[PDB]
Amino acid sequence: APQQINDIVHRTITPLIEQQKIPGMAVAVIYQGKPYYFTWGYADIAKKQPVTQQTLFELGSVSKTFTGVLGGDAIARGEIKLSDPTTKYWPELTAKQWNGITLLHLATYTAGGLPLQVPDEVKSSSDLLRFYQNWQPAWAPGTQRLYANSSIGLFGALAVKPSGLSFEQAMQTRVFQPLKLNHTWINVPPAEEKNYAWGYREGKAVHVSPGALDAEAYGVKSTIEDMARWVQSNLKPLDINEKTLQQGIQLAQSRYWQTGDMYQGLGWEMLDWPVNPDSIINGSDNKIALAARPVKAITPPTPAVRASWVHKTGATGGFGSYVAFIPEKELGIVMLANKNYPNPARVDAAWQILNALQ
C-alpha cells in the first residue's frame, strides 16, 4: 500500500463519505496492474456489520458491462452477429416497427426510443412480448441514443438464446468462472447473505426489487475484490486464456457511436484520454446521461482504443457504484457504496484519484 496511493485515496474519499452521508464504502485502485483495497463504515447499520473486502454490493447498471461482454463473447463464438435483425432471435416480434432494428441497436440504446424502464406491469414472457410489440419508436433506428434497460436488457436475453442456456447460467459459465469472479452473483446464495450489505434510501435498509430483464440490466452483486479483478480483465484482455472471452471484452470496448466527446460501446462508455474532467464529471449527471441525444455512426466501429478513459456508473435504490480505467496506463478504480449519491461526485473523486497517480 504505497503512501502515494494511500494518501490520495483517503484524502479524497473521507470527505466524500461525510458530505454525502454514505454508510459504507469500498474502493480499489488498480495501480500498475496490482490492486489495492480500502474500506469504510457499515454494510449493515442495524447490526454493526462493517464493510470488508468480502462485502457484496448491488452494482446497479454497472451490470450492463457484464452483459455487454457476455454478448461480445457470444459474437466471438459465432453464435450471434450485431448485424442480425432482432427478429431473427425472436420471430414472434412481427410488428412492423422492428423491421430494421438490429442487435447492435439494442445493445447501444439506438433502436429508436426504447424506454428507460420496463414497466412494472410486465412479467410473463407473454407480457414482455406484448410490451415490445406495442412499443412505437420515436425515431428511425441508429439516429438517436436514449439510455435504457429495455434496450440492452433485451439484447442480453437474445444474445444467449443460441446457447440454450439461461442468461444467468451463461454469465456464470462464460464470464464469472473463467475470470475467477467466485463472489459475483445475479442471485445471492443463502450462504452469502451474511456478506450482502444493505442499501440505504432515506435511512431505510433496502435491496433491489425483482423485475423483467433485471439480471441483464441491473442485477449483479459483487465484492470490491471481484470488481477489481473485473477491472484488471478489461484493462488487459490479452492476458485472458479463453479466446472468445478475450475477444468479447475487446468488442465491448469498441467505439460504435459518438455523441459529443463520448463513445458508446457494449455496456462500457469511452472518451479519449487525456480527458477533460468537466466533460466526464458533468456528463455523468443523470439529467445528461439519460437524455435523448443524436449520434454519429462510426463506420466501421473503432477497435478498443488504449488511450481511453473507459467507465460506467451504476445505481439501485440503495447503492451507488462507479468503475473507470485507462488501458494505456494500466490504471483503474472501483467505488462501491451502500447509498445512492450524485454521479458527478463519484466521477470527480475518481478523477482526483487517477489523475494524481498519473
Residues of this chain that bind its own copies (CB under 8 A) = 75-76, 78, 81-83, 102, 104, 238, 243, 247, 251, 254, 256, 297-303, 305-307
Q: Tell how far CA 344 is from the center of its chain.
A: 17
In the complex, least distance from residue 83 CB atom to its own copies, rounded to whole angstroms: 5
CB 224 within 8 A of CB 321: no
* Burial call 175-190: b when 16+ CB within 10 Å, e when fewer: bbebbebebbbbeeee
CB nearer to its own copies: give 79 or 285.
79
In the complex, least distance from residue 171 CB atom to its own copies, rounded to whole angstroms: 21
Residue 340 interacts, among ligand C9P, its own copies, none and using kind-specific CB cut-offs from 5 to 8 Å, with ligand C9P
Residue 314 interacts, among ligand C9P, its own copies, none and using kind-specific CB cut-offs from 5 to 8 Å, with ligand C9P
Residue 335 interacts, among its own copies, ligand C9P, none and using kind-specific CB cut-offs from 5 to 8 Å, with none
In the complex, least distance from residue 207 CB atom to ligand C9P, rounded to whole angstroms: 10
In the complex, least distance from residue 288 CB atom to its own copies, rounded to whole angstroms: 25
CB nearer to ligand C9P: give 211 or 248.
211
Residue 81 interacts, among its own copies, ligand C9P, none and using kind-specific CB cut-offs from 5 to 8 Å, with its own copies
CB 35 within 8 A of CB 28: yes
Q: Which of 224, 180, 217, 177 is nearest to 27 (CA)?
A: 224
308 flagged as catalytic: no
CB nearer to its own copies: give 83 or 124.
83
CB nearer to ligand C9P: give 28 or 148.
148
Q: Which of 155, 171, 144 is nearest to 107 (CA)?
A: 155
DSSP of 194-230: GGBPPEEETTEEE-PPP-TTHHHHT--EE-HHHHHHH
* Residue 34 neighbours by CB distance under 10 Å: 12
The helix or strand, by DSSP H or E, that contains position 58, with its residue range, turns out to be: strand 57-58
Binding site for ligand C9P (CB under 6 A): 60-61, 116-117, 149, 208, 211, 218, 286, 290, 314-317, 340
Q: Which residues are catalytic?
A: 61
